[PDB]
């Protein structure tokens, strides 16, 4: 029954509820994604307002929508769950009717649609979430990375970041990512990712998680050590100068 128009236009042509939705994203922990020549890496920072958590069970920042696609986000956690569930459901429906898993762009266009819809339906507020969706289209080896925002707008990036201090890390990426020669290695790609996060995480071995997605449903998350090792080798690059 509740159908109040919460997302409406203001005199200057803005939709404040969608605008404020973005502000919630700026407040979320940082998320980054960079595509290599044969992979895509997703990095997220871990808050520290409280520390004494049980990492095993506490929900992770990167979510698998299907065996070949993952989604990360910045913004309201409770909100992201709703989008993730719908995305996972839509992934199975697509496989059931088309007899082929979703492409990354399709899955992206779907999530974005759900977001756009919540900006012009009565009785609901927009999602205070922005997402990075990556993976490999069925039987394809070309890496895919997309980004969506509260408005429902989406697009693909060579590398992109969202969340707090994303401004900073984006600059890093803009003057550290050459489209001519993308991180031709899973390793050098993960490194560039860690580097960009260190610009804002401020020494956080346990405050930085990384997930590597390769063709054909090959997805794996790194452990503290594996990452911590990257950090170490990186702090030296600096000191060795």
């Amino acid at each position: 029954g509740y159908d109040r128009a919460l997302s409406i236009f203001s005199p200057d042509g803005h939709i404040f509820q969608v605008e404020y939705a973005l502000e919630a994203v700026k407040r979320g922990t940082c998320a980054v994604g960079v595509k290599g020549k044969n992979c895509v890496v997703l990095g997220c920072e871990r808050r520290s307002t409280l520390k004494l958590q049980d990492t095993r069970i506490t929900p992770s920042k990167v979510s698998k929508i299907d065996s070949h696609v993952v989604l990360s986000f910045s913004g309201l956690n409770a909100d992201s769950r709703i989008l993730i569930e719908k995305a996972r459901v839509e992934a199975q429906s697509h496989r059931l009717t088309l007899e082929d898993p979703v492409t990354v762009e399709y899955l992206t266009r779907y999530v974005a649609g759900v977001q756009q819809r919540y900006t012009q339906s009565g009785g609901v507020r927009p999602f205070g979430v922005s997402t990075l969706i990556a993976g490999f289209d069925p039987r394809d080896d070309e890496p895919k990375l997309y980004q969506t925002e509260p408005s429902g707008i989406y697009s693909s990036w060579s590398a992109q970041t969202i969340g707090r201090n994303s401004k900073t890390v984006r600059e890093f990426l803009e003057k550290n990512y050459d489209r001519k020669e993308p991180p031709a290695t899973v390793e050098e790609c993960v490194k560039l990712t860690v580097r960009s996060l260190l610009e804002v995480v401020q020494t956080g071995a346990k405050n930085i998680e990384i997930t590597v997605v390769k063709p054909d449903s090959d997805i794996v998350a790194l452990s503290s050590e594996e990452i911590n090792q990257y950090v170490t080798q990186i702090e030296q690059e600096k000191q060795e100068q």
């Binding site: 698998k64 299907d66 459901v89 992934a91 199975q92 429906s93 059931l96």
Partner: peptide, 16 residues
């Protein structure tokens, strides 16, 4: 069969 298959695969993904 395919309906059940779809549901189980969905559960597998949701709960890993």
């Amino acid at each position: 069969a395919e309906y059940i298959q779809a549901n189980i695969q969905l559960y597998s993904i949701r709960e890993d």
